[PDB]
C-alpha cells in the first residue's frame, strides 16, 4: 500500500501576523495555519519499521531551525576559516513556537503510538496522520527543554548502546522545572532547580539505566571535555546565550531541593549550524528570565573496561534534539 520514501515536507504553526516575535515572523512566511480538525486513523493488525537515526525528517527540521536563526538571530560578525562576515546585528523578540510538519498529496506520515518504543524497530500500534504534533525548536545541550514527555515510563534511546561513541537520548516522564535569570559577573546569571524533583528524576533514570546492563553500578559526572556549549547546559533565552554549569545536576550526591546553577552570558559562541564562531552584541538591559521544563537528557557513556558505568552530559548535533521528537514518525508514499 505504501513505501518508505522521501520528499519535501511542509510546516504549519498557529502563528499570528499580529505578532513581532521572531519565531512568529518566520512561520508566517513559511508555514500554513494548523489544520483545525486532524483525522488520525489507527490501523488494525499492522506493524511498521522505524529508525529515528536514519530519519530524513530530522535533516529537514535541521535546515528550518537554521533558517530561523539565520533571520531570527543574526550575529554581528561570524567567523569561519574560509569566511569572515560583519553585518547588521539587531536584537529581536524571541520565543520558540511549536512547528508541525505535514505531508503533501501522494504521501502520508506514520506514527508509532507504543508508549515504550526505542526509535529503531517495528511498531504494533501504528496510526496515520497528515501532520506531526507541534514541536518547539528549542536549541539546547545536556538537558532537553520544553519537549514532549514519555507517556508512561522513562525511555532510553540510542542506536548502539554498547558503542560509547553514540548519543544517549533520555526522554523523562516527569518534567523538572528550571528557572534561569539574569537580573538588572554583571553578565552573570543563574538557574534554580528543585534538588528533590531533579534527584527523583536522576534516580528514576539511573535505575532505568542499570536495567540495560547486568548488575552494574551507575554514576553521573560532569562532561569529560569540550567546547563550553557542550560542557554547560547552554541555550538562548530572549536572544541571549546562557551557558549554565550543570556540575550540580550531574553528580552522585544531589543537594537540597533548591540548588543554584552559575551561568554566564556570552557574546562569542561556537556555532551549531556550522563550524565557526558567531559574535553577538552585548546583552540587553533587564531581568531576562526563563522557566523551562526539562523533558529529556543527552548523555554519553564512558568506554573502556570500567565496577561502574558512568554517564556524562553530552551536547551532540542538534539534529538529535529534533530526533527526540521525530522518533515516532516516518514518511510513506502511497
Amino acid at each position, epitope marked *: 500500500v505504501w513505501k518508505e520514501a522521501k520528499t519535501t515536507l511542509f510546516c504549519a504553526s498557529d502563528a499570528k501576523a499580529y505578532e513581532k516575535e521572531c519565531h512568529n515572523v518566520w512561520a508566517t512566511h513559511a508555514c500554513v495555519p494548523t489544520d483545525p480538525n486532524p483525522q488520525e486513523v489507527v490501523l488494525e493488525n499492522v506493524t511498521e519499521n522505524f529508525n529515528m537515526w536514519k530519519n530524513d525528517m530530522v535533516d529537514q527540521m535541521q535546515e528550518d531551525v537554521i533558517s530561523i536563526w539565520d533571520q531570527c538571530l543574526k550575529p554581528c560578525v561570524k567567523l569561519t576559516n574560509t569566511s569572515t562576515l560583519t553585518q547588521a546585528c539587531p536584537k529581536v523578540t524571541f520565543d520558540p513556537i511549536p512547528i508541525h510538519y505535514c505531508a503533501p498529496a501522494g504521501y502520508a506520515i506514520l506514527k508509532c503510538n507504543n508508549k515504550t518504543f526505542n526509535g529503531k524497530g517495528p511498531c504494533n500500534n501504528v496510526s496515520t496522520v497528515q501532520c506531526t504534533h507541534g514541536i518547539k525548536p528549542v536549541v539546547s545541550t545536556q538537558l532537553l527543554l520544553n519537549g514532549s514527555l514519555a507517556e508512561e515510563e522513562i525511555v532510553i534511546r540510542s542506536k548502539d548502546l554498547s558503542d560509547n561513541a553514540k548519543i544517549i537520548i533520555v526522554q523523562l516522564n516527569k518534567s523538572v522545572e528550571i528557572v534561569c535569570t539574569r537580573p538588572n559577573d554583571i553578565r552573570q546569571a543563574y538557574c534554580n532547580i528543585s534538588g528533590r524533583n531533579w534527584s527523583e528524576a536522576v534516580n528514576q533514570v539511573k535505575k532505568k539505566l542499570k536495567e540495560h546492563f547486568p548488575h552494574k553500578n551507575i554514576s553521573f559526572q560532569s562532561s569529560s571535555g569540550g567546547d563550553l556549549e557542550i560542557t554547560t547546559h547552554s541555550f538562548n533565552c530572549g536572544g541571549e546565550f546562557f551557558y549554565c554549569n550543570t556540575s550540580g545536576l550531574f553528580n552522585d550526591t544531589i543537594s537540597n531541593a533548591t540548588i543554584m546553577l552559575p551561568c554566564r552570558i556570552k557574546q562569542i559562541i561556537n556555532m551549531w549550524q556550522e563550524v565557526g564562531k558567531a559574535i553577538y552584541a552585548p546583552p540587553i538591559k533587564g531581568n531576562i528570565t526563563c522557566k523551562s521544563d526539562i523533558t529529556g537528557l543527552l548523555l554519553l557513556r*564512558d568506554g573502556g573496561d570500567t565496577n561502574t558505568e558512568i554517564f556524562r552530559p553530552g551536547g551532540g548535533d542538534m539534529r538529535d534534539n529534533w530526533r527526540s521528537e521525530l522518533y515516532k514518525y516516518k514518511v510513506v508514499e502511497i
Partner: antibody, heavy 125, light 104 residues
Framework: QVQLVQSGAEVKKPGASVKVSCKAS????????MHWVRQAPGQGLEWMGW????????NYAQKFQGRVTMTRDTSISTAYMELSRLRSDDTAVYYCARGKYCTARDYYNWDFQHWGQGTLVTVSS | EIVLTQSPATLSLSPGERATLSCRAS??????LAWYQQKPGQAPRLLIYDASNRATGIPARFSGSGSGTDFTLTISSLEPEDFAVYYC?????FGQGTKLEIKR
C-alpha cells in the same frame, strides 16, 4: 593522499605530564573522530579515548581519568593528547587513529582505517 | 564491558597453506568486528572492516566470517608478506593478538 603525522619521540620523567601532537591531512578534520591508542613493548593495544573535533567533545577510558587530556585546534588540523602524572608503565608507543566513516554517516565508527606513525615514549628516572 | 579472546596465541604455517584465525567475544552481542595486521616497528594496518568487508588495497586472499561471538579471518594462501601479528577489535576493545609465523 590522506596522511596522519605525529610529533617526535619524547622522553619524560616519572610524575611529569606529556602532550603529543597528531597533524592530519587529506580530509575535513571536523568530519571524523580521532581516537588514541597505545602499545607497550611487545604488548597488545590499549584504547585511551576519542575526541570529536567539531565540538571538542571527548570520551575517556575509565582506566585513566584526570591523567589524560585530549584537545584539538581546527585551524591547524592537529589533535593533541596530554597524559599527566605518568607511571613507568605508561612507557609505550602512542598512535592516533581515524574511523573509516564521517561522524555524519553515523555508522560503526571504530574501523581504524588510518593510523599515525606512532610516538615512542619513555618514563624513566 | 566486553572482552576479546583470539586463538591460537601463535600460528605457524607455510606459504600456500590456508590460514584461519579465530576471535571469540565474551558475552558480546555486536556483529561488527575489524581485523588488523601489524609488523614490528610499524603502525597497524586495517585488513578487514565490519567483519566481512575487505579493506581497500587489501588482496583477495583475505576473508572475514562470523557473527555473534565467534569470528574468523581467512587467508587462502600464505604469502611471504602475510606473516605478522593479528588483532581483532570491537568498539574500543582489542584482542590480545595472534602471532603468525613461518614454520620450519
Amino acid at each position: 593522499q590522506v596522511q596522519l603525522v605525529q610529533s617526535g619521540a619524547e622522553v619524560k620523567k616519572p610524575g611529569a605530564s606529556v602532550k603529543v601532537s597528531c597533524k592530519a591531512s587529506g580530509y575535513t578534520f571536523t568530519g571524523y573522530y580521532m581516537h588514541w591508542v597505545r602499545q607497550a613493548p611487545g604488548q597488545g593495544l590499549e584504547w585511551m579515548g576519542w575526541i570529536n573535533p567539531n565540538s571538542g567533545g571527548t570520551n575517556y577510558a575509565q582506566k585513566f581519568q584526570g591523567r589524560v587530556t585530549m584537545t584539538r585546534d581546527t585551524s591547524i588540523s592537529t589533535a593533541y593528547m596530554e597524559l599527566s602524572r605518568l607511571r613507568s608503565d605508561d612507557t609505550a608507543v602512542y598512535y592516533c587513529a581515524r574511523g573509516k566513516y564521517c561522524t555524519a554517516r553515523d555508522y560503526y565508527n571504530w574501523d581504524f582505517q588510518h593510523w599515525g606513525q606512532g610516538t615512542l615514549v619513555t618514563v624513566s628516572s | 564491558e566486553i572482552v576479546l579472546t583470539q586463538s591460537p596465541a601463535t600460528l605457524s604455517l607455510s606459504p600456500g597453506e590456508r590460514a584461519t584465525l579465530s576471535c571469540r567475544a565474551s558475552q558480546s552481542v555486536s556483529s561488527y568486528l575489524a581485523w588488523y595486521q601489524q609488523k614490528p616497528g610499524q603502525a597497524p594496518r586495517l585488513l578487514i572492516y565490519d567483519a566481512s568487508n575487505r579493506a581497500t588495497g587489501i588482496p583477495a586472499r583475505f576473508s572475514g566470517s562470523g557473527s555473534g561471538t565467534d569470528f574468523t579471518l581467512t587467508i587462502s594462501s600464505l604469502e611471504p608478506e602475510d606473516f605478522a601479528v593479528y588483532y581483532c577489535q570491537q568498539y574500543e576493545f582489542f584482542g590480545q593478538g595472534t602471532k603468525l609465523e613461518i614454520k620450519r
